[PDB]
Amino acid sequence: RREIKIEGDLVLGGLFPINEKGTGTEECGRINEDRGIQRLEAMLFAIDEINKDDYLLPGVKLGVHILDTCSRDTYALEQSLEFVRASLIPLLIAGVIGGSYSSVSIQVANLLRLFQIPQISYASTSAKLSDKSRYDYFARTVPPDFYQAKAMAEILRFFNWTYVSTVASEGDYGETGIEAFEQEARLRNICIATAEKVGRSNIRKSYDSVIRELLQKPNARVVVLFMRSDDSRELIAAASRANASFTWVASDGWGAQESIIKGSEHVAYGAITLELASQPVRQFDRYFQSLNPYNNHRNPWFRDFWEQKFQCSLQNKRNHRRVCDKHLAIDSSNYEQESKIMFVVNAVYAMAHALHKMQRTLCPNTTKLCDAMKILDGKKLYKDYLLKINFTAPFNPNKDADSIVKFDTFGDGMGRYNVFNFQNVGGKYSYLKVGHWAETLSLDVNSIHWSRNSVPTSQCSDPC
């Protein structure tokens, strides 16, 4: 296995979904180009920025203990044992800035709550979390799935889609989200045509029974997806194979990423997805576009990533593929910033300020490491400082209410979303924003490209 073990006075661990589930060694195969390396480099850039500046955490240097979660909760639990090994090269971790999947975050929080280690997530949106009775050391920077369910129910009601079908992914993310969506639909007089639960368990659908059942009922052409990025890609590939076209109202799992839609653009011409409200970070783009496989030695996976993004394998020597050694680097022509980078950078600074206001209180006499801070109890770090943190966005020139980084009474974030429609402009398929959602709906119907160039309808019976 590979990991980053940069040392420092204070170590902020993290867990990232660098590798995809399965597809080799029965554990994890291919590398997530978008959700596995961009967030990792964003966290590294944030750590470097905190260390290089003097305004935030002077003197004290921040190190990382980043680990790879192979898109599995069991693998994440196995890897997280090293974070609590010291309290059970033993390193004392003051915080785990990690957790991208709901199941992975839940397992990591359950393991960490015994050792009193605060944890901050950046992409895990679930209603099972934020329950302080069972998760008392969890505080994410993203809103739960309740707001997503409300927004998607409002979207369905806006277009008068009543007879809709629902497809969910088994686990701690799809199940709770689809339950909340069912409750919201029942509230808004919306009846679910059918309910499916895609999973990899012993008794589960084989990615074709769901599509066969969907085609069995042609009266409901709207499918609401609560699925992760690992299962949505395979489901859309199976749909493309079966040549079954439906309009897609997807959750944050699909997002606004083009990795899922690769070779299956036709099957998902009409797709509406919800993404967290994120603005691009220019500094992160500048840092990432200057990365090379020769000057980046602290990222073990990056070299392998260099063999996957550019389709140029055999970086040293082999007959598998041509050696694209030089004359080709990461540029804006093929690199797009992830829609959650500011959610992970703010996930780091949230602890940094928590480590900045604490050292200013326990031992304010010296602006450095002190003997009184030898032991870092998680209760004081989380409840006293981290819970009531309040700071502006580190890399946002604008200073407004939407650019503040503060938690809630349950350790959550602002419930603002954006709606992306998959449109084909000039022969190019891409996601375009067609509205937003901040306790209201602002869809732009006049600028929406549908699957059949017409507004779809989904009613149980034709009005008579």
Place this chain on the structure above:
Amino acid sequence: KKVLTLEGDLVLGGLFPVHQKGGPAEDCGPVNEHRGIQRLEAMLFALDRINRDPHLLPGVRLGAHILDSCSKDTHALEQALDFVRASLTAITGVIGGSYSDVSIQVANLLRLFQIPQISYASTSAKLSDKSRYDYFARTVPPDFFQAKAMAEILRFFNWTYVSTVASEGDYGETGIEAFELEARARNICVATSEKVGRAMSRAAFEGVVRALLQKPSARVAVLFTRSEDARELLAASQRLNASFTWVASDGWGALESVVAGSEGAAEGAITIELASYPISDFASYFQSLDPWNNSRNPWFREFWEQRFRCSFRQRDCAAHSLRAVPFEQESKIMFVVNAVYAMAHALHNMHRALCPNTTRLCDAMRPVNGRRLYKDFVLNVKFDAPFRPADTHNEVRFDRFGDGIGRYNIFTYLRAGSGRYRYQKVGYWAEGLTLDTSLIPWASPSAGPLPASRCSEPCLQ
């Protein structure tokens, strides 16, 4: 908190719900007199018998490290840290886990440290996945057969329109899923699906009862609930004066605390328990127990104060004996004993397969590894049951996923002998439904029409 520990060459773990689930303020309060104390005493009695047995580990003495989870997964996870802090006097195996949610977290924690665990009452369909829970065995059948049995019972009585309520967790949701999948093939239809949260108040229970009462076509109610949740639902139904035909699972079983104070709301209720037989020696061992000599059980005193409503500071229960009070044995007792034996013979064959020198603990077996033990001696073990009654035909074996034979019994709560309100067995279930309607009071043709629940009654032909 209090930890029950013994001394021996090999120490066996334990995890029992001695106390009941507490409120928002306290952690966990009242002691469980049937599912927390009787099972613990059964495990202790089995360990004593194994230690006294000459043919079973004549030189190796089995210890005990019984803990208390008190029906909380977080508390169970906090307590189970002692099972792994020794190794990081080590724990050989963990005989514990009475709830699916309680056992799943413990299994996940123990899989990292390669510590085998054999449960005694965990009945969940998601615990059979060997890819996620590598080191976990069970003596009781999963819910895969219980859901089928309840579907068969529902189909036998010509019930079509039913309502389902389940507890939020890894035992109720999986039960609803399996029941729905096995009912889709049949003509069973579910009207509404209701969920009971872990922290649920009386107002929410009343709201759930009202939601069930909103649709009057459905007369029955399928139950996947724990003891406390089922008791609270029955109490709410009694408060609202609502009568149903409850179809429950092993969570209710044949307990008397669920029907304590709510006998009116629970009339003619069909429940399913696991196939079991009383243990002759365990009854005598439990009845011959006193709070003074039995100083090895820290919770026993807490049980005694709850058994006859006394107080040791007030000098009460000085002449109270458990022998006089009638004894009701828990259905899932023998399984617990079997679980202990599931780690006894597994530690007996291995000692005869890796260290064939002496009968004591040799220096080569000091670091007992759970990997080889579970893969070669625990998963494939066959032996005669310890305390078989008469000369029946039963065997203790583990399947490919560490399961048991799916045999169930059907009980009905009926009032006989001037309202005794007792459970009566009206058949069993091994491979097909073979219940008898003669013993059921409301199923008799002379008693009255059979309770029916259909979405639409058959109109004129």
